Design a protein around this ligand. Structure first.
Ligand SMILES: CNc1nc2c(cc(C(=O)N(C3CC3)C3CC3)n2C[C@H](O)CO)c2c1ncn2C
Length: 287
């Protein structure tokens, strides 16, 4: 549906970036402070290219109905289009994990992993490529439910191809990128699987700053390397089977899933359905 901007009461900025921002608002049409708290995404600097990219993003989210995908609530028109989503009270999985390290066990991490795989399998069914799987893009509804919380880089596959070539201006999250995304700008369900492997790594490191993917790769590449060279050196490291280490305390069977996601050969990477089965099997064994 449509939301009138005049009844959208700003409460707090939730997160930013060069694209725009996400705000916590209260949609109070009766002006009696009984309206619901919603999350509002807006474009900070909007070209006609950015406006059209954001229109596709809204259509993509509107088309998704799944327990592990943040709910689309509507749009807001002024010139300045806004995407209205449900408010998830625990924020990103990155921040929630980091704050409750001592209360979240491996069985709990695997419950979240399984939800991410299920939400991602639903995406693939619509031929959508997320392109930005990271714990900062996963939101926490409650202690038992996580949801893919942003679709800013999501692309629809062409009808004739299993990949999508795209080189966006700006800073790309290169330490989550599959080798073929770095070398050829090719994005597919298989590069989403590679990035999912990195999400799995992030979870089992409990978001330790020293143990983060930029920190680990930047150490393996050498902090003396800078600029466009980092990309070149990362490509070479990946090409020579250089990988993120097994996180402290991580079981071998969980690191095995990560390394299987990090296959150089695109076609050898597991599917999200197989990842979900495997994760479920492991958490049943643990329980
Ligand atoms: C607290 N609840 C919510 N916080 C949100 C968002 C979206 C972001 C956010 O800024 N981004 C994330 C999508 C990836 C990013 C800018 C796009 N943040 C910040 C986050 O809490 C950091 O802990 C959200 C929330 N509820 C529903 N949504 C959509």
């Amino acid at each position: 549906t449509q939301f009138e901007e005049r009844h959208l009461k700003f409460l707090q900025q939730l997160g930013k970036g060069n694209f725009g921002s996400v705000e916590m608002c209260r949609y109070d049409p009766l002006q009696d402070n009984t309206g619901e708290v919603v999350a509002v995404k807006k474009l900070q600097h909007s070209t006609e290219e950015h406006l059209r990219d954001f229109e596709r993003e809204i259509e993509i989210l509107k088309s998704l109905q799944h327990d592990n995908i943040v709910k689309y609530k509507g749009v807001c028109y002024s010139r300045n289009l806004k995407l209205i989503m449900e408010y998830l009270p625990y924020g990103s999985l990155r921040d929630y994990l980091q704050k409750h390290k001592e209360r979240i066990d491996h069985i709990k991490l695997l419950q979240y992993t399984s939800q991410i795989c299920k939400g991602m399998e639903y995406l693939g069914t619509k031929r959508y490529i997320h392109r930005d799987l990271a714990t900062r893009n996963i939101l926490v509804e409650n202690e038992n439910r996580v949801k893919i919380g942003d679709f800013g880089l999501t692309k629809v596959l062409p009808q004739d191809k299993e990949y999508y070539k795209v080189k966006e201006p700006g800073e790309s999250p290169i330490f989550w990128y599959a080798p073929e995304s770095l070398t050829e700008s090719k994005f597919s369900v298989a590069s989403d699987v590679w990035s999912f492997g990195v999400v799995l790594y992030e979870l089992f490191t409990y978001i330790e700053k020293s143990k983060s993917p930029p920190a680990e790769f930047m150490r393996m590449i050498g902090n003396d390397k800078q600029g466009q060279m980092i990309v070149f050196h990362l490509i070479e490291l990946l090409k020579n089977n250089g990988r993120l280490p097994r996180p402290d305390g991580c079981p071998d069977e969980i690191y095995m899933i990560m390394t299987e996601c990090w296959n150089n050969n695109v076609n050898q990477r597991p599917s999200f359905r197989d990842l979900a089965l495997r994760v479920d099997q492991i958490r049943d064994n643990m329980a």
